[PDB]
Design a protein around this nucleic acid. Structure first.
Ligand SMILES: [Mg+2]
Ligand SMILES: [Mg+2]
Ligand SMILES: [Mg+2]
Ligand SMILES: [Mg+2]
Ligand SMILES: [Mg+2]
Ligand SMILES: [Mg+2]
Ligand SMILES: [Mg+2]
Ligand SMILES: [Mg+2]
Lengths: 111, 144, 125, 25, 54, 217, 129
RNA sequence: AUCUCUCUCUAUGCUCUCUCUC
RNA sequence: ACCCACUCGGCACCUUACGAGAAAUCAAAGUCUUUGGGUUCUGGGGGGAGUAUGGUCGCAAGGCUGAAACUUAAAGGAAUU
RNA sequence: UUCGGGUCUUGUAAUUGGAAUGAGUACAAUGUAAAUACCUUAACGAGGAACAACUGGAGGGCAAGUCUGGUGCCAGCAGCCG
C-alpha cells in the first residue's frame, strides 16, 4: 500500500525504505520550509536562509512522493536566475527532527 | 447540383464569391490584413536582434520535463518584451545579461516548438559571433 | 547596366531526396561512368527531360503539321550529330525513350575508355 | 460543459459591461 | 545541482583518431560504389549495408 | 501432395490447358493458387507493407499483422492480396497465395504513334476503395511511372512502361491506395473502345469441352 | 424549368447506357440534339434513332448499340479557340485518340477531328466516349 | 384480447510506454 | 359508401445495389474522376468566439453583422474489438 | 577418392613502388587605357604526416549503427511524432 491501495498501483513498485540515509547540503542547494503548496507543480516555500523564493517541483517526486504543508525540503537554487527555484529532495519527519537535533539547519521553524 | 454558378455570362459573381472565400485561408488573411507588420514582434522581418533583460529558466510542457533555459529580449527595432530560447547545452554561460543578441524563428511559421510554452524564437548570434561556432570551439566572443 | 547576361540552371534536383531505388540507380550509373558529382547525372537527366518536353509538344501537334515537320526533324538531326539516337531510330517515339544510360556513354569520360587509352574510367577522367 | 449556460454567462457579462459604460458616461 | 552546462563539462573529451585520408569527390564515390554494388559477401539474405560487432 | 480439388485445377494438372488467357476469357472460379504457378511461369512475389493491427480484449492486446502483397510477371497480368495473421512470414505467404489467386490482366494501351510492342495504358481509368481515388492517365514513352512508391511498384510488377497517376483521399492508408489501383487496372479491360467494336463469336469453355477429363469416375 | 434540353437528353442517354436498356425517350428534343445524334451515328455510337417529331415539340426514341460508354455536355458552351482544343481533348476524352468532342461551329455541328480538318473551331457542345 | 405491479441514497481518485526479420 | 383494375397529385413506407457513400446509411444523399442541368447561400484545424470594437434595428432585454492577438496538435465524424 | 592448382577474372588491407598533373608560385611573352586573372609556357612542384573538405544527419517520417564510454525526467535533443 502506498496511498489508496487501488487496482492501478501494483504496476509501479517503490524502493527506498524508511531506514534510508539522510542527504546533506550542497553548493547552490539549501533547506526550505513550505509556505503554501501551490498548483500546477509550483509551490511557495520559504527558505531557511532568509529569502521568500518560488519553489517548483522538478520531475522524480511529481508522482512518486506526495508532499504536504510545512515540510523541510532540499531546494537547489537557480544559478542563473534567483526568484524561481526547484525542489530536489523531500525530507522525512524523523529525518527533519534529526537535522534539527544536529543543528545543520537554523532553528526557526517547527515540524 | 454544384452550388457554384456555371454560366457563360456568370463570371463577376463567381469571382466575388472566390474573393470572399479566400478571406478564410489563414495565410492569405495574414498576408493581407498586414498582421505581419501591425502585430508580431518580428514585424515583417526575418532575423530581429535585441538585448537581454532576464535569464529565465522556463519549465517545459508535459510528457517531457526539465528546466529549459530562455532569454527575455528587448528588441532594438520595436521594443517589445520577448521570450526567446537558447540552443545547445549551457550556451547561457556565453550569453549574459545586457549583451546584444540576434534572433530567428523555429521552423514553425510563428507558433511555438513542441515542448516550450511562450517561446517563439531561437537565440542565434550572441554579440554577432553565432552560438553554433561558440559551441564547437571554433571562434571566441568579444566580452572584455 | 548591360542587361542580357542570363544564367541558366542546367540541372533538376529530384523532388524526393531519399527515394531509394532512384538513388541506387544514380550510384550505379556513377560507378559505371566515373562521376564526381551526382549533379552531372542530374544535369544530363535535365537535358534529356528538356528534349522529352520538346518531343511531347511536337507530338501534341498533329501528324505532318509544319511545326512537327520542322522542329522534330531538327531535334533528330541534333541527336544524330551527338550520336545517342540510332540511325534506324528517327521517329520521335525513340527520342521520347532514349533512356539515361546513353548520354553517359557518348561523352569523353566514356568515349576515351570505349576504345581503350586508359583501361579504367577513373584513369580516363 | 453546457453551451447554453456559457452563452447566458456571456450575456450577463455584456450587460455588466454596458452598465459600467453607462456609469462612466 | 540541476544547473546549465552539464554533460560537456563532465564527459572526458577523447581526441580524434589520426586515420588514413579517406578520398574525395570522384574517388570517394568510386570507393562507395565498390563497397555497395561490386561484390558484397552477403549475397543470400538481405540488402543490408551497415553491420554491428554482434 | 499437389492433388487438386476443383475440376479446372484437375484439368490444369493433366496438361490439357497451357493458357491463362482462355481462363480470363471465360471468367473461371479459381480457388487453388497451384493453377497460376503451373501456367504463369515467372511471377515476382513482392510484399508492400506490414501493418500492425490490434483488438484490445481484456487481458492486454492482440497483435495481428496485415501484409499487403503485389504479385505478377512484367507483362500484363498482375496479382493483388491482403492478409491479417499472427506470425508475419505466414501472413505474407497467405497474402502471396491470395495474390496469385487474384491475378488480373491489363489492357496495355498506346499513345498514337504506335510504332511497336505493348506500351502503357488504354484510357483515363479510375477506381475507389475507400475515399482514395486513383487516376491512371496514359503517359508518353519514357515518362516514367509517376506515383506513390507503392503504386509505382505495383505498376512495375504489372509491366507498364509509363503512367501518370492522380490521388484523392487519404493515401497514407497504403492498402486502400493499392486496392484502388488494382480496381483501376481491372477497369482498363472492362471498357468498350473502338479496338473491340467488331464482335467475335463465343468460343466454348474448356470446362464444358474437357469435362470428361476433369472428372475421374 | 429545364434550362438545357440537350443536356437532359444526354443525361437520359447515359442513364440508359448504365442500365443496359437499349431504348430511350428524349422528352423535348429537336435540332441540336438531332444533330448530335446524327454525329454519333456517323461514328456508330448509337444504333438508330427515330423521333415522333409530332405537331408539338418532338420526342426521340434511340435504339442504341450499347457500345457507347459516356456522353457529356457542358452547358456553359465555352468559346473554344483553335489551340486549346488539344487541352479540352486531354481533359474530356478518356483515350488520347479514341472518342469525339462535339463542337457547334459556324461550319455546323460536328466532332473535333472533323472541325480540325475544316480548320474551324467554335463552341463545345458535348462529347462521346 | 390475459397484461398483472413496483421501490431509494452512492462523493472523488493523480503512477508512463513497446516493435522486428521476408 | 364499398371491391378490382388503372393512372394523376401528396405524406410516407418496405425490399434490394445493380449505384452513391468515410461509413452509419440513401430511390435520393443515385446519374460525382466517365468530374460542367440551372441557380442562390454558407464552411476552410480546434480554441479564443459568436466574444472585443464599430455600425445599425430595437422602450429595453437582445438580434443582425463580425474580427484579431495569442494558443495548442489535435478537436471531430462513422464504425470496430 | 581428403586436398588442390587459382589454373580464368576480380574485391581487400599503413604495406612497397613505377608514371602523370594544376593549385599556388612564377623568367618572360601575350593580354590591356597601362597591369591583374584567364587562355599559352621553359624552371621549381604529392607518400598519407602531406598540396590536409566540409556540411548536416543515422527510432520513424527519410538514406544510414538493438556499436563503444559518459549523463541519469538531470543536461539536453526533437520541424511533428517523440
Ligand atoms: Mg510488480
Ligand atoms: Mg478556425
Ligand atoms: Mg457589439
Ligand atoms: Mg477524437
Ligand atoms: Mg592556371
Ligand atoms: Mg560529421
Ligand atoms: Mg530507414
Ligand atoms: Mg544532433
Amino acid at each position: 500500500n502506498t496511498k489508496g491501495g487501488k487496482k492501478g498501483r501494483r504496476g509501479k513498485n517503490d524502493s527506498d525504505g524508511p531506514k534510508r540515509e539522510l542527504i546533506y547540503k550542497e553548493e547552490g542547494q539549501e533547506y526550505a520550509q513550505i509556505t503554501k503548496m501551490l498548483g500546477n507543480g509550483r509551490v511557495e516555500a520559504s527558505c531557511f536562509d532568509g529569502n521568500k523564493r518560488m519553489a517548483h517541483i522538478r520531475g522524480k517526486l511529481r508522482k512518486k512522493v506526495w508532499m504536504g504543508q510545512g515540510d523541510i525540503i532540499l531546494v537547489s537554487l537557480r544559478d542563473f536566475q534567483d526568484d524561481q527555484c526547484d525542489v530536489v529532495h523531500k525530507y522525512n519527519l524523523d529525518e527533519a527532527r534529526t537535522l534539527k537535533n544536529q543543528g545543520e539547519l537554523p532553528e526557526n521553524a517547527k515540524i | 447540383g454544384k452550388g457554384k454558378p456555371r454560366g457563360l455570362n456568370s463570371a463577376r459573381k463567381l469571382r466575388v464569391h472566390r474573393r470572399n472565400n479566400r478571406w478564410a485561408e489563414t495565410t492569405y488573411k495574414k498576408r493581407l490584413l498586414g498582421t505581419a507588420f501591425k502585430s508580431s514582434p518580428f514585424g515583417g522581418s526575418s532575423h530581429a536582434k535585441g538585448i537581454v533583460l532576464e535569464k529565465i529558466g522556463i519549465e517545459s510542457k508535459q510528457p517531457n520535463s526539465a528546466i529549459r533555459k530562455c532569454v527575455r529580449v528587448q528588441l532594438i527595432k520595436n521594443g517589445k518584451k520577448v521570450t526567446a530560447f537558447v540552443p545547445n547545452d549551457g550556451c547561457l554561460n556565453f550569453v549574459d545579461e545586457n549583451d546584444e543578441v540576434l534572433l530567428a524563428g523555429f521552423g514553425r511559421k510563428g507558433k511555438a516548438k513542441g515542448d516550450i510554452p511562450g517561446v517563439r524564437f531561437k537565440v542565434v548570434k550572441v554579440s554577432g559571433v553565432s552560438l553554433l561556432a561558440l559551441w564547437k570551439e571554433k571562434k571566441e566572443k568579444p566580452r572584455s | 547596366p548591360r542587361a542580357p547576361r542570363t544564367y541558366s540552371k542546367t540541372y533538376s534536383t529530384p523532388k524526393r531526396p531519399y527515394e531509394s531505388a532512384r538513388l541506387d540507380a544514380e550510384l550505379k550509373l556513377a560507378g559505371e561512368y566515373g562521376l564526381k558529382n551526382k549533379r552531372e547525372i542530374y544535369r544530363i537527366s535535365f537535358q534529356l527531360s528538356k528534349i522529352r518536353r520538346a518531343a511531347r509538344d511536337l507530338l501534341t501537334r498533329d501528324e505532318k503539321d509544319p511545326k512537327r515537320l520542322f522542329e522534330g526533324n531538327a531535334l533528330i538531326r541534333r541527336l544524330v550529330r551527338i550520336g545517342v539516337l540510332s540511325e534506324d531510330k528517327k521517329k520521335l517515339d525513340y527520342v521520347l525513350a532514349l533512356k539515361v544510360e546513353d548520354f553517359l556513354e557518348r561523352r569523353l569520360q566514356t568515349q576515351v575508355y570505349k576504345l581503350g587509352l586508359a583501361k579504367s574510367v577513373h584513369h580516363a577522367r | 460543459m453546457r453551451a447554453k449556460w456559457r452563452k447566458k454567462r456571456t450575456r450577463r457579462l455584456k450587460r455588466k459591461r454596458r452598465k459600467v459604460r453607462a456609469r462612466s458616461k | 545541482l540541476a544547473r546549465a552546462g552539464k554533460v560537456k563539462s563532465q564527459t572526458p573529451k577523447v581526441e580524434k583518431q589520426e586515420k588514413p585520408k579517406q578520398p574525395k569527390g570522384r574517388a570517394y564515390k568510386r570507393l562507395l560504389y565498390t563497397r555497395r554494388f561490386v561484390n558484397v559477401t552477403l549475397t543470400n539474405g538481405k540488402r543490408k549495408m551497415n553491420p554491428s560487432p554482434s | 501432395g499437389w492433388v487438386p480439388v476443383t475440376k479446372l485445377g484437375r484439368l490444369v494438372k493433366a496438361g490439357k490447358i497451357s493458357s491463362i488467357e482462355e481462363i480470363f476469357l471465360h471468367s473461371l472460379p479459381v480457388k487453388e493458387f497451384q493453377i497460376i504457378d503451373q501456367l504463369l511461369p515467372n511471377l515476382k512475389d513482392e510484399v508492400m507493407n506490414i501493418k500492425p493491427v490490434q483488438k484490445q480484449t481484456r487481458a492486454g492486446q492482440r497483435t495481428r499483422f496485415k501484409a499487403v502483397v503485389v504479385v505478377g510477371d512484367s507483362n500484363g497480368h498482375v496479382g493483388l492480396g491482403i492478409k491479417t495473421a499472427k506470425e508475419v512470414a505466414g501472413a505474407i505467404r497467405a497474402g502471396i497465395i491470395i495474390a496469385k489467386l487474384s491475378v488480373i490482366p491489363i489492357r496495355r494501351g498506346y499513345w498514337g504513334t504506335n510504332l511497336g510492342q505493348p506500351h502503357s495504358l488504354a484510357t483515363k481509368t479510375s477506381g475507389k476503395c475507400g475515399s482514395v481515388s486513383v487516376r491512371l492517365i496514359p503517359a508518353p514513352r519514357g515518362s516514367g511511372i509517376v506515383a506513390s512508391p507503392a503504386v509505382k511498384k505495383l505498376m512495375q510488377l504489372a509491366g507498364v512502361e509509363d503512367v501518370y497517376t492522380s490521388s484523392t483521399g487519404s493515401t497514407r492508408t497504403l492498402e486502400n491506395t493499392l486496392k484502388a489501383a488494382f480496381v483501376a487496372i481491372g477497369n482498363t479491360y472492362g471498357f468498350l473502345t473502338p479496338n473491340l467494336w467488331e464482335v467475335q463469336a463465343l468460343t466454348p469453355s474448356p470446362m464444358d469441352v474437357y469435362a470428361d477429363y476433369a472428372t475421374a469416375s | 424549368t429545364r434550362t438545357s434540353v440537350l443536356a437532359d437528353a444526354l443525361n437520359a442517354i447515359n442513364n440508359a447506357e448504365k442500365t443496359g436498356k437499349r431504348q430511350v425517350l428524349i422528352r423535348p428534343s429537336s435540332k441540336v440534339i438531332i444533330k448530335f445524334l446524327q454525329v454519333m451515328q456517323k461514328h456508330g455510337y448509337i444504333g438508330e434513332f427515330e423521333y415522333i417529331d409530332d405537331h408539338r415539340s418532338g420526342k426521340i426514341v434511340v435504339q442504341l448499340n450499347g457500345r457507347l460508354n459516356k456522353c457529356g455536355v457542358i452547358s456553359p458552351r465555352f468559346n473554344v479557340k483553335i489551340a486549346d482544343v488539344e487541352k479540352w481533348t486531354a481533359n474530356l476524352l478518356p483515350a488520347r485518340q479514341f472518342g469525339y468532342v462535339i463542337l457547334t461551329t459556324s461550319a455546323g455541328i460536328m466532332d473535333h477531328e472533323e472541325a480540325h480538318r475544316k480548320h474551324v473551331s467554335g463552341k463545345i457542345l458535348g462529347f462521346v466516349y
